[PDB]
């Protein structure tokens with residue numbers, strides 16, 4: 369099982385920066401949408417649904433904006449964010465990269481700085497054969513631009 373960010377090199381585990389464009393203007397009360405399907409994709413390293421991968425997002429995933437409320441959309445369910453439970457499982461068995469069905473909804477001068485981590489999303493992988501060779505990924509979401517209020 370592997371992933372990449374913006375079509376880059378393969379990632380098997382660990383922490384990776386994910387850079388996102390945010391609305392530069394936000395008014396008190398507005399809602400920011402971060403569509404991570406535009407950046408993070410994952411695939412099965414054998415294909416053919418031979419040793420299917422099972423991935424979910426993990427309890428504790430949170431803003432970094434620590435006081436913000438929000439929602440996290442993952443694979444047909446919208447969870448309160450920060451995550452207080454593990455999400456449903458997405459199964460990945462094709463070698464073709466699958467953009468992750470993942471969106472973050474954020475409700476808050478400069479409020480978000482370019483280059484600062486605004487959320488840490490922990491993803492867990494376990495496959496089917498043997499032990500499933502479980503792996504941990506963390507996606508550190510980073511804004512490419514300032515967001516001002």
Ligand SMILES: CC(=O)N[C@H]1[C@H](Oc2cccc(C(F)(F)F)c2-c2ccc(F)cc2)O[C@H](CO)[C@H](O)[C@@H]1O
Pocket residue numbers: 369370379380381411412413414415419420421495496500501503
């Ligand atoms: C030890 C491990 O993880 N076996 C996983 C397996 O891994 C690979 C399969 C082929 C090629 C590679 C490599 F060429 F990339 F090494 C990997 C691999 C190994 C370690 C990683 F950290 C990530 C991918 O692929 C499977 C389907 O996806 C399951 O996931 C399975 O459990």
